[PDB]
From Swiss-Prot, chain A:
Residues 1-19 are annotated as: Disordered. Present with 67700 molecules/cell in log phase SD medium. The gene is NOG2. GTPase that associates with pre-60S ribosomal subunits in the nucleolus and is required for their nuclear export and maturation. Belongs to the TRAFAC class YlqF/YawG GTPase family. NOG2 subfamily. It comes from Saccharomyces cerevisiae (strain ATCC 204508 / S288c) (Baker's yeast). It is found in: Nucleus, Nucleolus. This is Nucleolar GTP-binding protein 2.
UniProtKB/Swiss-Prot annotation, chain B:
Belongs to the eukaryotic ribosomal protein eS8 family. Ribosome biogenesis protein NSA2 subfamily. This is Ribosome biogenesis protein NSA2. The chain holds residues 67 to 131 of 261 of the full protein. It comes from the Eukaryota. Residues 9-20 are annotated as: Interaction with RSA4. It is found in: Nucleus, Nucleolus. Component of the pre-66S ribosomal particle. Interacts with NOP7 and RRP1. Interacts with RSA4 (via WD repeats). Present with 8660 molecules/cell in log phase SD medium. Involved in the biogenesis of the 60S ribosomal subunit. May play a part in the quality control of pre-60S particles. Under normal, rapid growth conditions, high levels of NSA2 would allow the progression of pre-60S particles through the ITS2 processing. It comes from Saccharomyces cerevisiae (strain ATCC 204508 / S288c).
């Protein structure tokens, strides 16, 4: 900190008002649009859909 | 055929003598699962 802390960045950007959408890994590098993309590198629910 | 023989869609003159409630046909298809 002080600037390095992500809380200060969130307060400055105003995203704290909508922090409910805080994605795991929200940082300056590799924001949600990239964190979600990378998470795909980490389909078998065997659900029974009604094909009507 | 022999027994039957022993007893005894109009088409144009040029086509003769020649070779011839909105449900889908297959509702409720098999439930292929995510597997």
């Amino acid at each position: 900190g002080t600037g390095k802390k992500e809380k200060s960045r969130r307060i400055r950007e105003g995203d704290t008002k909508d922090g409910n959408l805080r994605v795991k890994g929200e940082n300056f590098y590799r924001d949600s649009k990239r964190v979600k993309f990378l998470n795909m590198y980490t389909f078998q629910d065997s659900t029974i859909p009604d094909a009507r | 055929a022999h027994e039957q023989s022993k007893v005894k869609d109009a088409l144009p003159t040029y086509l003769l003598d020649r070779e011839q409630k909105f449900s889908v046909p297959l509702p409720k298809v098999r439930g292929i699962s995510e597997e």
